[PDB]
């Protein structure tokens, strides 16, 4: 046995956890408000993201 045989499990688990967390970062929808379509009827352009 060398030196990289006994660290395989921990390294694989580290890689899997980092991959799962990257998936969480990428595919999770961000924080946006919950609006009824009738609450903002005619006001849709106000919440686009502009600062006008």
């Amino acid at each position: 046995e060398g030196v990289v045989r006994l660290t395989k499990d921990g390294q694989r688990l580290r890689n899997m956890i980092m991959s799962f967390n990257a998936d969480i970062v990428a595919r999770t929808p961000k924080k946006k408000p919950f609006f009824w379509p009738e609450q903002i009827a005619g006001f849709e352009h106000m919440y686009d993201g502009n600062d006008d």
Partner: protein, 52 residues
């Protein structure tokens, strides 16, 4: 005869030190092959078994 005496002596010595032999063999296997001493659970069900 000689054969019977030799086998009797060997059997006495083997049986006297059985438990120490088994414990030392386990220590060798644990520190050289793997720390999951599962003779059974080889087809029971495949579950994660880390080596840390």
């Amino acid at each position: 005869n000689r054969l019977e005496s030799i086998l009797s002596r060997f059997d006495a010595d083997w049986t006297a030190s059985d438990e120490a032999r088994r414990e030392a063999k386990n220590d060798l296997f644990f520190s050289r092959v793997s720390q999951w001493d599962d003779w059974l659970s080889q087809y029971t069900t495949l579950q994660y078994r880390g080596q840390f």
